[PDB]
Design a protein around this nucleic acid. Structure first.
Ligand code: NA
Length: 108
DNA sequence: TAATCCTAATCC
DNA sequence: GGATTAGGATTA
């Protein structure tokens, strides 16, 4: 019976742009964090969109691999630049570096 | 076809 | 950042 607040709407829009896939745990987390029902979160995501893995292109992979080899530390500015030039969100760039570091640690 | 490999994305 | 799963492609 209550409208989403400005902060609730803004957060939902950010979440959906970052990742439109709602797992059970993510629906529960967002429900708790936002103070909205799971049904409300689920309906809002379904309306907006009416395990998704990105297929990183050869061009995206070549750039990420080169950037990691040049510098393993990812500044916010470079994260933003790579998000812009590669068409990936900042979280995806951060996770790519994290996964690549973990793969290296698993080897040597 | 089924085993096996790579790694993006989740959950913590 | 650690642990692990899961898309999905490759290999045998
Ligand atoms: Na990744």
């Amino acid at each position: 019976r209550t409208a989403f607040s400005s902060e609730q709407l803004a957060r939902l829009k950010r979440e959906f742009n970052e990742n439109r896939y709602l797992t059970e745990r993510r629906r529960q987390q967002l429900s708790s964090e936002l103070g909205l029902n799971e049904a409300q979160i689920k309906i809002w995501f379904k309306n907006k969109a009416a395990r998704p893995r990105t297929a990183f292109s050869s061009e995206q992979l070549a750039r990420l691999k080169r950037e990691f080899n040049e510098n393993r530390y990812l500044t916010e500015r470079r994260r933003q630049q790579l998000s812009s030039e590669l068409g990936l969100n900042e979280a995806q760039i951060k996770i790519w570096f994290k996964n690549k570091a973990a793969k290296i640690k698993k080897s040597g």
